[PDB]
Enzyme design. Structure first.
Site, PDB file in Angstrom:
ATOM      1  N   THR A   1       2.278  -9.229  -2.936  1.00  0.00           N
ATOM      2  CA  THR A   1       2.563  -8.960  -4.376  1.00  0.00           C
ATOM      3  C   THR A   1       1.433  -9.513  -5.264  1.00  0.00           C
ATOM      4  O   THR A   1       1.183 -10.720  -5.243  1.00  0.00           O
ATOM      5  CB  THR A   1       3.916  -9.572  -4.758  1.00  0.00           C
ATOM      6  OG1 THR A   1       3.798 -10.959  -4.428  1.00  0.00           O
ATOM      7  CG2 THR A   1       5.087  -8.925  -4.045  1.00  0.00           C
ATOM      8  N   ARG A  29      11.682  -0.997   4.446  1.00  0.00           N
ATOM      9  CA  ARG A  29      12.308  -1.939   3.489  1.00  0.00           C
ATOM     10  C   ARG A  29      11.510  -1.910   2.188  1.00  0.00           C
ATOM     11  O   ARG A  29      10.269  -2.009   2.224  1.00  0.00           O
ATOM     12  CB  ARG A  29      12.427  -3.356   4.047  1.00  0.00           C
ATOM     13  CG  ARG A  29      13.586  -3.572   5.015  1.00  0.00           C
ATOM     14  CD  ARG A  29      13.662  -2.629   6.201  1.00  0.00           C
ATOM     15  NE  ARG A  29      14.699  -2.954   7.188  1.00  0.00           N
ATOM     16  CZ  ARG A  29      14.873  -2.307   8.331  1.00  0.00           C
ATOM     17  NH1 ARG A  29      14.091  -1.284   8.642  1.00  0.00           N
ATOM     18  NH2 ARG A  29      15.840  -2.663   9.160  1.00  0.00           N
ATOM     19  N   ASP A  32      11.152  -5.413  -4.922  1.00  0.00           N
ATOM     20  CA  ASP A  32      11.143  -5.157  -6.380  1.00  0.00           C
ATOM     21  C   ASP A  32       9.834  -4.497  -6.838  1.00  0.00           C
ATOM     22  O   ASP A  32       9.856  -3.801  -7.873  1.00  0.00           O
ATOM     23  CB  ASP A  32      11.333  -6.447  -7.157  1.00  0.00           C
ATOM     24  CG  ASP A  32      10.228  -7.431  -6.867  1.00  0.00           C
ATOM     25  OD1 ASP A  32      10.156  -7.871  -5.732  1.00  0.00           O
ATOM     26  OD2 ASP A  32       9.402  -7.664  -7.757  1.00  0.00           O
ATOM     27  N   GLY A  53       8.246 -12.220  -5.760  1.00  0.00           N
ATOM     28  CA  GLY A  53       9.194 -13.154  -5.130  1.00  0.00           C
ATOM     29  C   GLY A  53      10.133 -12.452  -4.172  1.00  0.00           C
ATOM     30  O   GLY A  53       9.755 -11.432  -3.612  1.00  0.00           O
ATOM     31  N   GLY A  55      12.315 -10.030  -3.070  1.00  0.00           N
ATOM     32  CA  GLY A  55      12.530  -8.682  -3.645  1.00  0.00           C
ATOM     33  C   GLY A  55      13.991  -8.409  -3.978  1.00  0.00           C
ATOM     34  O   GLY A  55      14.291  -8.004  -5.059  1.00  0.00           O
TER      35      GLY A  55
END
Ligand SMILES: [Cl-]
Ligand SMILES: [Cl-]
Ligand SMILES: [Cl-]
Ligand code: NA
Ligand code: NA
Ligand code: NA
Lengths: 135, 155, 134, 159
Positions: A1, A29, A32, A53, A55
């Site tokens: 991320t 999978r 966020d 963080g 998700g």
């Protein structure tokens, strides 16, 4: 991320988030990062947010949009909204991480509840600030 | 005008990491935020600034996006990205893509050249390829650092 | 697109949404239906919502969450929040459709801005209400 | 508040000019049957989570409605299905997007909620998760209806 938020000279806000997911992730999978309002949100009228963080917790809590709604509807400042989401609501669901946010007035916040968050910010024509660890 | 960037939150400890290790991240974050600042100073759009910053964070193998993506269980890469324009409230997003070097440029493409917010997997990829985005092998993302972290995480 | 919202005797809210998307859709396009806060949301503190409509707008608007946040933070009634999102905010962004919503007090709303919406609701131990048109 | 259920079968350009009462009552009968199932479950003390799961499962099964059986056709004359479920009590959610080999996406969404640490799964990954937890693989042909195929043809040219 990884992610970026910005307010330009014209008052536009924009946000972007990009990720490889998490080490040892099973196929298909989704956290966020690619989800509007969870990992990424921008509105000239409120805030630009990018998150990083756990998700599933950032999705369940709609973290990015929740910043905008706490400010818009709850009358919270950016600082108050970030404290509420990152330091109270995310941990309440078992959720680690942080986010970066700029509001339409140019307030900037880089909250995180983790040991670190690779981060930086600067105003145009100013020296940038960088950080890895807490305070 | 102002930019903020991140390269991920989590269990970064000092006892594990050397200063030279830490300085590589600091220098990387510095150069990218500075590139963003100079673009804003020059009157480039918020959209173009966050797109370029995230493109640079993707290119940088230190950060878990694009080049230097984490490995899946099956030892390949699945990348996700979103971009939103506060001016129009338009947004574009791709999830589960392995053949696009820069997911944030794919996401921007979904925003600008489709009526959709979100595309996944081979539909997203074929959508980008049909608009002249290059197909890459997910091998291009792989780094020793992230492979070593995969082997560590399996324990 | 289809969905259901419910309040149970224990005071719990839940929401579910399911779709095949839109006729002639290209592969791999995703609308609001599977996205938390866009096509589906539930919180015991506020509301359960299931949406149906232009997926791109319902995502950009976080339609489902926006109902919850208008009630929880803004103190709007279910009716007021539904009016605001479905009749004002979504049309302003080019979005047509509607939603079903139940709040934590058992108020029910089935707002839509389209000609019709296949819909029904009922209280436990009551006769159901069904509708299609306005 | 009194336990209560609402359902929808989608919003769009539906006009009286387009249907007979008998054709309307086909939709009314389907919505009534499903909402009545939900009401009876709520009255018996079943959970809001279990009621919305079953209501959406029935709407998927019902060929009249664009989910599960009766899904609209993609450009490629197949079916890609998406679903979400959320529990207001735990704020857990589960969601699947872009699945073609699961009869009931809402049950796959509920499996993601209950039997994984994740909220969202896509495509073959979502399908394989569901198969590994013992959900049955189906042909996407099972969703195909003449009604929706005719809508696909009226919406395009032939070539
Ligand atoms: Cl530091
Ligand atoms: Cl941590
Ligand atoms: Cl040194
Ligand atoms: Na990178
Ligand atoms: Na491939
Ligand atoms: Na159906």
């Amino acid at each position: 991320t990884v992610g970026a938020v910005a307010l330009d000279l014209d008052g536009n806000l924009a946000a972007a988030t990009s990720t490889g997911g998490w080490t040892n992730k099973l196929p298909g999978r989704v956290g966020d990062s690619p989800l509007v309002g969870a990992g990424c949100y921008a509105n000239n009228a409120s805030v630009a947010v990018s998150c990083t963080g756990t998700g599933e917790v950032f999705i369940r809590a709609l973290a990015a949009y929740d910043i905008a709604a706490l400010m818009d509807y709850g009358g919270l400042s950016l600082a108050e909204a970030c404290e509420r989401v990152v330091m109270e609501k995310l941990p309440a669901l078992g959720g680690s991480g942080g986010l970066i946010a700029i509001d339409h007035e140019g307030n900037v916040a880089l909250p995180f509840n983790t040991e670190g968050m690779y981060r930086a910010w600067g105003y145009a024509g100013d020296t940038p600030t960088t950080g890895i660890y807490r305070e | 005008a102002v930019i903020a960037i991140h390269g991920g939150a989590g269990a970064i400890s000092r006892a594990q990491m050397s200063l030279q290790q830490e300085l590589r991240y600091i220098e990387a974050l510095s150069a990218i935020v500075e590139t963003g600042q100079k673009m804003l100073e020059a009157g480039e759009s918020a959209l173009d600034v966050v797109t370029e910053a995230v493109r640079l964070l993707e290119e940088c193998p230190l950060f878990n996006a694009g080049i230097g993506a984490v490995f899946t269980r099956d030892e390949t890469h699945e990348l996700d990205a979103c971009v939103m324009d506060g001016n129009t409230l338009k947004a574009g997003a791709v999830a589960g893509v392995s053949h696009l070097r820069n997911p944030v440029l794919a996401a921007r493409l979904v925003m600008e050249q489709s009526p959709h917010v979100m595309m996944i997997g081979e539909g997203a990829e074929n959508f980008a390829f049909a608009r002249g985005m290059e197909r890459v092998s997910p091998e291009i993302f792989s780094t020793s650092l992230r492979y070593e972290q995969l082997l560590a995480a399996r324990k």
